[PDB]
Each structure stands twice: as C-alpha cells, then as structure tokens.
Design a protein around this ligand. Structure first.
Ligand SMILES: Nc1ncnc2c1ncn2[C@@H]1O[C@H](COP(=O)(O)OP(=O)(O)OP(O)(O)=S)[C@@H](O)[C@H]1O
Ligand SMILES: Nc1ncnc2c1ncn2[C@@H]1O[C@H](COP(=O)(O)OP(=O)(O)O)[C@@H](O)[C@H]1O
Ligand SMILES: Nc1ncnc2c1ncn2[C@@H]1O[C@H](COP(=O)(O)OP(=O)(O)O)[C@@H](O)[C@H]1O
Ligand SMILES: Nc1ncnc2c1ncn2[C@@H]1O[C@H](COP(=O)(O)OP(=O)(O)O)[C@@H](O)[C@H]1O
Lengths: 581, 571
C-alpha cells in the first residue's frame, strides 16, 4: 500500500499540494458520491487539463483543513497508480498480488481511506494477460459493495471507449462531470495560485498578466483546456524572465501581458503582442497597406479592411467569421491578390491563404471532398478539403475561387460557414470558421461589371445587376455574405503601378551579383499592349515577364557573344534586341 | 562517502571537460524548460552532442571568473550518479534499498542544494522513480531518441505532466572543429600532435554527400581519434613519416570498408578536370549530351549559390523513351552515388481512371490511398535522391493539360504535410513522342539545328500553343541504326558471356553474326525493349538446347554456319 499509493492527504499537511480555488460544486458532488452507501465511487470526468486531479487535491486539502462533513473527516486520500502496479509484473499473478495486497491493506483501513485512481482507463485492461481482465475485475466486488471509495479521474472519451465498454464496471462509478471553467472563472484560480509561482520563480506576476493569461489562452489556444494553458503561459513567462535576471527598473522581473502574448506568439504564431510596435501606424493605415500590393480597387479594400477592423475592435459577431466576401468581377484585377494581402496583413503570412478552386466541385458527388466522407465510406478518416485545412490553420483567408463554377449544392455546404462560422466534418467534428475570412471570387456578373465601370461611378454596379441574370433566385446565400464586392477593371493608370513589384521582393538580395536596375520609361507600353487588357485582365502580365524579358538569355547561350553580367534594356523599334558588353 | 557525492570543483583541477560549441539557442531552451515548476523536466531528443554536458560546464564559467557579484550567483546544482546502482547489489529487494536511499537522504538541508538526474529512459524511467517524480522531489534532465520517446515516454499520461520533447536540429561541420581547438592542451604539450585544417573537415563532410543514413558528430569524433592514433603504434610494427597532415590519415580509416580512395571525396575547384573521365566514359565512350549539366550549369549551384526557388540546374533534356533515359538516370547516379538506386519512371500513357489527381504533386483530401498515391509522393519520403522523368503527357482530353505550369515557378513550394521536397539537385529528362517517330529510319542527314525551328514551327500552334512556348531546347537521342545497337547488343551479350563462362563456355560472335539479329531486333514503338527477347529467341533458347544436349562440350569454342530457313548456330 505504501509501496504504490501516493498519499495525497499527508502531501497536503506539508503544504506540497497546489491551493485549489473554486471547484466547490464538483468537490461537494464528489463528497456526495463518496458518502453513498453502495458504489461510493466518483469519477471526475472531464477533458485533459480541466482540474480533475486538482479536485482531489482540493478534497485532500479539505479533509486536513476540515471543510468536509463528518463521515469524510479524518480520511486519507491515497493516490493509487496503475502504472506502478503493472510496473514489474512479468510472471503469473504478480499483478494480482499487488491489487490483492493493496485491496487487503484498504480493508485493514476499515473505510478510513479514500482511493484516488487517477486515469481509471489505465485500470480497464491492466493485468489482462491470459484471459478476462485483472484490474477492473478484481476491484469489481469491492467497488459495488461500497468498500474502497474509489475517486476516479478520467476524461470523457477515455471513459467512453474503456470504461463504458465494460458495462459491469461502468455502473460502479458515478460521473462527476468536471466542466472546464470559463475565462473569468480561471482568473480567481490563477489569482491565488500566482503566489505559489512567485515563491518558486522569485518573479512578480501582475494580475494584468493573469487577466490576459486567460483571455489569450482561450481565444488563441483551442486544443488545450483552460486552467492548463493559462498556468502554462505564466510558468513559461516566468521562466523566460528568469533568464533575463541571471545572465546577459529596466532589468525587470515583472510579468505583464507583453511577456504573456510573447510566449503565446512563440507557441501559435499570432502577433497581437503589443501596440508599442508600428501597430498604431498600422491600424488606421490598414486600408492603404493593402494598397501597397493591391493597386486601385478602393471598393475592395474598403470592404475588407473595414470588416477586419470591425473585429479587432471587438465589435463583430463571435458566431460568424471575420469577413464573408463575394468578389464577383473580372479576372486578374486584384481578387486573388487582395487575399494574399489580407493574409499578409492579419496573420502576416500570405502562405496562410487557403485557396480552394470550386471548379473541382462541379458535380454533386464531389461535395464530400470539402466536408469529408461519412462513417464507413472512402476518405472518411482522411477528412475534408475545407474542414481539415481549417483545422490546420484556423486563422486563414479562405479563397473559394470561381464559385459560380461549383455545383449549386456546394453553396448549401457554404451556408453554415457564412451564417455561423461552423462546418461539421464527416467524422462529426465541427471546425470553427470564426477566425477565418471567407472570400469567394466569382465571374457571374463580369460581362456587365466590365462594360459599366466608367459609366456608373461607384455604387450602381451593386444595384440592378441582381435580379435579371445574377444571383437573387437562390436568396439564402446573398444575405449571408458580409459585403458583396464588385471590381472595377484596370485602366492604364493601374497597370503602370501594378507592373512595378515584379522583382521588388527579390530586389533586396541580388545587388552584388551585378544587377541593379532603375526604371526605364520607354518599354512601358510594350507590356501595356498584351498585359493591359479590357477583356482578359492583367493576368497576362505575369506571362509578360516569362515571354517578354526572360527569353533571349537562357537559350541564347551557345552563339558566343552574349554572356551575363550586363543589364538588358528594351526600346520601341523593330530590333530583335542586341546586348553590348 | 563514495557513491552519492560528486564534487564539481574538481572539473578545473583535472581538466575533465569536453566543451560544447554550437548549441546555445538549443541549450538555453533546456534551461527555460528546467526553470519552471509545471513540466520542468527537459528530455533531450535527437542526434548527439548535449547529453547533460552543456548545462553543467556552461554553469561554472559565469560564477568563478567574476563579472557578476555574489548577491546574484548561487545557482550551484549537481549532476548524475548512475554507476553503482546495479553493481555490487546482490538480493531481490536489497537492490531496491539503495535506490530509495539515494533520493530520500539528499533532503538533509531543506532544499539548500538541488540535483539533476540524467539519461532516464530505461526502466529507471517510471517504475521506481515515478513516486519520486510525482511527489515533487527534484527535477531531472532526460535524454531519449525520438522513436524511443514514443516507445516509453509519451503514450504514458502521468509523465508528460513533467517531461516535454526538446528537439535539437542537425548540427554543423564545426562541431569537431572546436573539439580540436581546445584539446591541444592535452596533445601538443606532451605529444606534439598536429591535425591540420583539411584533416578536421575530412572526417566530417561525410553527411550531405557521402552517406546520409547516419548522424554527423558520432562519425566525426571517432574518425579523428583513430586517424590521430597513427604515430605511437605504427612505430611499433616490427622521409620517415608525413608530419604535414593531409587527407591521408582519415582515408586509411574511412575507406577500409568501401575501396574508393581520396581522389573523388573532396571534389573541389581544380578537381573538375579529374571528375570528367572516371566512370561515365569507361563503361561507354559516349553519352556526352548530358555532360552539359555538370559543366556550364554547375557554377551557380555547388559554390554556395543554389537558390532553390527558381530553376538554375534544371537543364531540359528530351528524346524518346526506353532508348537511353533510364540508363543515364542510373549512370549519372552511378557517377555520383557509387552504386545503383535511382529507379524513377513516369508516363501518362494507358490509364484512364480518376487516380491522375494524386500523381501530380500529391493528393488533396477526398481520395483513396495516400501511402503510395503517386510515385513522386513517396520518392522524397523514401530518400531525397531521385531523378524525375516525364513521359507521354500529350494524349488525354484537354481539361488535364495546364497543371504542369504550377510547380516550375516561384508561387508555392508544394509539399504535402509540412516537410520539404527536392528543388536543387534534380535533372528532369522528359520525352517528346510527337512526329520524331518516322525520323528514326535513316541516320543520313539528321538535323541538330534544322530540326526544332522549321519542323516544329507549323505543327505546334494549331491545337495547343501553351506547351512549347516555354520549352524550346530539342535535341534527339541516337537514331536506331545498325552499329550503335551492335554496341548495345554486345552489352546484353557480355552479361550473357559472364553468365556462360561460369560453366566453361566462351562464345564469340562476329560483326556479321550479331547483325543477323537486327532484322528481328528493335521497335520504333517500344525503343529497345524487344532487343532482349530477340537474344532469347534467336540464340539463347537455341543455346540452352545445345548446352543440355551435350553436343556443345565445355572447352571447345564453336563457330556458326549459314543454313536453312530457321537461323540457329549449329555445327
Ligand atoms: N480549480 C483549480 N484551482 C487551482 N489550481 C487548479 C485548478 N484547476 C486546475 N489547477 C491546476 O492546473 C493544472 C491542471 O492540471 P490537472 O489538475 O491535472 O487537470 P487534469 O484534468 O488532471 O489534466 P490531465 O490531462 O488529466 S493530467 C494543475 O497544475 C492544477 O494544479
Ligand atoms: N489590383 C491589383 N493589384 C496588384 N496586382 C495585380 C492586380 N491585378 C492584377 N495584378 C497582378 O496580376 C497577376 C495576376 O496573376 P494570376 O493570379 O494568374 O491572375 P488571377 O488573380 O486572375 O488568377 C498577379 O501576379 C498580380 O501581380
Ligand atoms: N556540438 C558539440 N559540441 C561538443 N561536442 C560534441 C558536439 N556534438 C557532438 N559532440 C561530441 O560527440 C559525442 C556524442 O556522444 P554522446 O553524447 O555519448 O551521444 P548521445 O548524446 O547520443 O548519448 C560526445 O562525446 C561529444 O563530445
Ligand atoms: N545506351 C543504351 N542504348 C540503347 N539501349 C539501351 C541503352 N541502355 C539501356 N538500353 C536498353 O533499355 C532497355 C530497357 O528499356 P525499357 O524497359 O523500354 O524502359 P524502362 O527500363 O525505362 O522501363 C534495356 O533492355 C536495354 O537494352
């Protein structure tokens, strides 16, 4: 008994237990089960990192401090470990002499000992070496007779496929559900626990670093549960500052939310850290920073930058994505380019744009590729194309390209992402679109968008295109769109400004090779004859570097006069261009 | 007073320190993890180098020298005792009284001194130290591998509340450089051992080029100590010695299981006259169309100039299929890898299913079979060495055409689950099976610079102008004549010679006798596939008819005759 079971009650007299704050409805319900006549076995069902191990450490602190009823007064909470019972059990019945050694020491205790079996699912099938099970089949009489007082603490899905499968052991435990506390319920958890970390780290932790250790944990960390990550963050931040005082008021020890969001940015990647950066320079110039790489399209950025300012002010709907856009209009105008800009603004990486081409979803059978296959079908455990991608990046700009080429029954899949920000996978797991920006480019009115842009100034392309030919006949999808955005086609004013960032990002490395080129002003309209298109758009400009500028170097090698090291020009003549050394 | 007392004042008295060089942003991480109280147990995971030696020697350097005052220093911790645990203890249970006595009586001063434990994976990894770890006794520094971590330390649940994966990334060549910078404190003052600059790097460059299945620094510290053991024992083997340290000391140590000397292990600036005439041009005198990729398109790749996100070493090479592609993708791998492992062939010829979505560059969800998928899905996860082919893409209906544009540009690097794919060391040979099928007849007046501009100018841009608008360099493989295959039909017969001299028959064949085969030999449709069965049906199946009949006795060389309507070589 003293070889295996850790005694939590004498670990509470030394003050070695964490102070437990709250939990008084789940501790009282635990004592209500622990005082039952038969089957006095609570199982603290929760999720990993909810506090179900620090409920019995708030029961064992309670027995010593005496807030328990008489009947649980003066008990002992022993923490049996089923990993130390299957530890060296090689031979036949070395495990069964460990339980029947522990179970017979618990009967000498005449009911003065509470047994905390943490992770009961490790008891289901613990011996089980030759036949029927040996741990939750040896406890099974003394669990039903109300004899050993077994506080279990498993999680809900570990209860579901370990303990619920043994239906004769499932009834010997009573589910004391430990729901995770809310964001305000874990501040008081962490306000009293902060001094137990101040005495260990020799580090002062402010309640600003605690009110933001939980609002940033809950919002940004979605796989963990709340009083496990909020105390991870303060322990990581107090260890990050504990370097700054050891090795090399301005050499601080205080944790503030500057250090808490810095650890969380180092965990997840979301840079909302401090507004003492150029973010004050960035929050009102949010519409013109997109204009750095989205040339023109003032109706486009004033729809997307005003919607992502609407949520950074905490004013947008938290049961809806950050933005739901329909980018109908011409091709090669700034549709796909703004979403790269919007990803390079919000999550500052244009690799965080989940592009989905809806020409792959032409027919109705190809809708379970986005959402996932049902149980029992091909591609079930794989997932969906949209749902699993949003589980990869929950903070991403979803591009749904040419949605008018989708099936009509894929807008039905796209009614719940727009309205509620949810999409359930084929495996019954719901993915959360509340942090994504769902932008949907289309070409459904583009014939009438292009002809009327220099006629109807800035608002009449929105009205009166809807109803004769365009989307109103299927009306449930239009009103779920946040802003329907029409795109004015590009004149010569924009493609001269759009054809300047072709090699601007590669510009900052390749100087010493022998290349630095300033703007030449004579070959401007050579690219503005194939690239500046009223019909097909500005996308043939990207081929107008692959067809116009890059050809007579990489194949004209063998003739023996043109060798690299000299910067090329282009002039308006019938030249078949030369290059002088 | 023997077992559980280790004094760390001795480490400067004896010089028992092997200094760590290179790891500081991956060791101060294991001081961030260790300084916590939730999950304050760093387990060091990966390739070697740290192993509880970086935090203990990088601890006395900041206290005894004296830049910081004494009001801040005092973080004096200790290290592992592991040696006398199992040894010297006899009974069952009286071995256990030594392990319970080593943890409980270090608590004589109420936590005045703290202690780390090192290398905890064996089970002492959670059978006798598990209450000693759950009681909040003291915190330890683990060290596992990655796969032995997921054997023991993570499919548990009570142990990752204290441990966490600390991964170290694969180290430099400068790991053993500074191992021999400090260690001349022990080498030259008493033995006068020099090891020069090209002799430290020589036993360490063996990873990215030579062999890539094994870690670097385990193969670096051992192959220097064996090369440095040269003097005192080769003088006791019953102008005198090169005291100028060269590549020779490691080569005796390294090449005692390969057989390849120094001559191609340090391919350098002047060595590229020597790496032209080694193995490519002794099996076959020829195959010099593909030598351009190692001559003019090699200057901006192997001098620290390989930019992966635009094709610079991608020299385009065309031809037919089954005609010399698969041998050169092996013979260039034979010119590089000293062996045969390049097995790549991609064709889009005779399969009509909906499985052509996964052969592109991977499968997005909604499919079957991700484990194989396409061939290139698996050809980087196997090993990063493969030479990618592209054949017969020109036939299917035009909805499938333009997906070849996405990979060759700088848009997105296109991996599949988060680890990298190959962009730097691959030559792509593709296959053009347009109207170069009637041209295989004669070898008289074949075009090298009349072929691709006037024949291709009027036939390409009627149906599809988006295919040869990018790709322009067209030069043909060998035309299938007589004597150029008479070399190739000698290669497949000389492996029939070695198949036959094992039983005592040396067969000759004439220039007249193997062009007897050429009427039943090659195919313009399949390439040189029906060459091998033509050896079986014409000579080899009649040969085994005569070896078994006993009328071809071993020892006597036989000649042929021209005879009646079935052509066999009889007496
Ligand atoms: N109500 C609470 N009051 C004080 N500390 C708490 C409270 N809830 C949780 N904690 C602490 O936060 C952490 C939560 O971990 P646990 O209590 O083990 O929860 P858990 O459900 O057992 O997680 P696992 O995955 O089962 S180990 C521990 O360090 C607890 O001390
Ligand atoms: N409004 C715009 N702002 C900035 N760049 C633009 C704009 N419109 C077009 N471009 C340029 O045109 C190119 C269009 O390429 P592509 O993505 O193939 O077209 P599309 O976006 O229609 O698919 C982009 O690389 C981009 O640089
Ligand atoms: N970065 C480095 N700095 C110093 N020594 C190193 C470094 N990398 C490797 N070594 C040497 O390599 C050897 C690795 O052996 P070891 O630490 O026993 O392997 P493992 O860590 O797998 O147990 C050590 O003796 C060490 O001296
Ligand atoms: N240098 C060469 N010239 C002509 N034919 C060759 C050469 N090297 C190999 N071959 C032939 O290629 C054949 C294999 O080709 P094949 O099976 O059609 O293509 P793959 O091997 O790519 O499937 C071998 O039988 C061999 O005779």
């Amino acid at each position: 008994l003293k070889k295996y079971t850790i005694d939590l009650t004498e670990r509470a007299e030394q003050g070695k237990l964490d102070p437990v704050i709250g939990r008084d409805e789940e501790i009282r319900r635990t004592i209500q089960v622990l005082q039952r006549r038969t089957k006095n076995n609570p199982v603290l069902i929760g999720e990993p990192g909810v506090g179900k191990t620090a409920i019995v450490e708030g029961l064992a602190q309670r027995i010593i401090n005496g807030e328990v009823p008489e009947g649980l007064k003066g008990r002992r909470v022993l923490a049996l470990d089923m990993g130390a019972l299957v530890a060296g059990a090689k031979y036949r019945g070395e495990f069964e002499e460990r339980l029947k050694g522990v179970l017979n020491d618990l009967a000498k205790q005449e009911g003065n000992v509470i047994l905390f079996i943490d992770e009961l699912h490790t008891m289901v099938g613990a011996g089980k070496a030759d036949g029927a099970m040996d741990a939750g089949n040896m406890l099974k009489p003394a669990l039903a007779r109300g004899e050993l007082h077994c506080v279990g603490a498993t999680t809900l899905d570990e209860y579901r496929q370990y303990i619920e499968k043994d239906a004769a052991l499932e009834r010997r435990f009573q589910k004391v559900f430990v729901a995770e506390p809310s964001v305000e319920d874990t501040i008081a958890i962490l306000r009293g626990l902060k001094e137990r970390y101040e005495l260990h780290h020799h580090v002062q932790i402010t309640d600003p670093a605690i009110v933001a250790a939980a609002t940033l944990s809950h919002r940004y960390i979605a796989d963990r549960q709340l009083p496990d990550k909020a105390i991870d963050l303060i322990d990581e931040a107090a260890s990050s500052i504990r370097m700054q005082i050891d090795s090399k008021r301005l050499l601080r020890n205080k944790v503030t939310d500057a250090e808490i969001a810095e650890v969380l940015a180092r965990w997840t990647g979301i840079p909302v850290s401090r507004m003492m950066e150029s973010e004050r320079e960035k929050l009102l110039r949010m519409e013109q920073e997109l204009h750095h790489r989205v040339i023109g399209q003032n109706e486009a950025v004033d729809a997307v930058s005003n919607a992502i300012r609407r949520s950074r002010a905490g004013l947008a709907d938290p049961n809806r994505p950050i933005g739901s856009f329909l980018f109908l209009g011409p091709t090669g105008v700034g549709k796909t380019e703004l979403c790269k800009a919007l990803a390079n603004f919000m999550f500052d990486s244009d690799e965080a744009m989940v592009r989905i081409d809806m020409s792959e979803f032409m027919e109705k059978h190809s809708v379970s590729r986005l959402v996932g296959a049902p149980p029992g079908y091909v591609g079930y455990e794989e997932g969906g194309y949209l749902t699993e991608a949003v589980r990869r990046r929950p903070y991403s700009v979803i591009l749904l390209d040419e949605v008018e080429k989708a099936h009509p029954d894929v807008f039905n899949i796209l009614l719940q992402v727009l309205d509620d920000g949810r999409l359930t996978d084929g495996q019954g797991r719901t993915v959360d679109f509340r942090n994504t920006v769902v932008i949907m480019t289309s070409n459904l009115g583009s014939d009438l968008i292009q002809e009327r842009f220099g006629e109807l100034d800035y608002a009449h392309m929105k009205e009166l295109v809807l109803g004769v030919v365009s989307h109103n006949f299927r009306p449930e999808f239009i009103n779920r769109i946040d802003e329907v955005v029409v795109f004015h086609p590009l004149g010569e004013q924009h493609i001269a400004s759009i054809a300047q960032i072709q090699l601007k990002r590669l510009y900052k490395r390749l100087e010493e090779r022998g290349y630095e080129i300033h703007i030449s002003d004579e070959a401007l309209k050579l690219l503005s004859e194939n690239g500046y298109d009223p019909v097909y758009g500005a996308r043939p400009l990207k081929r107008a570097i692959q067809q116009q500028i890059e050809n007579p170097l990489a194949q004209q090698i063998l003739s023996g006069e043109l060798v690299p090291g000299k910067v090329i020009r282009l002039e308006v003549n019938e030249d078949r261009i030369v290059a002088v050394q």
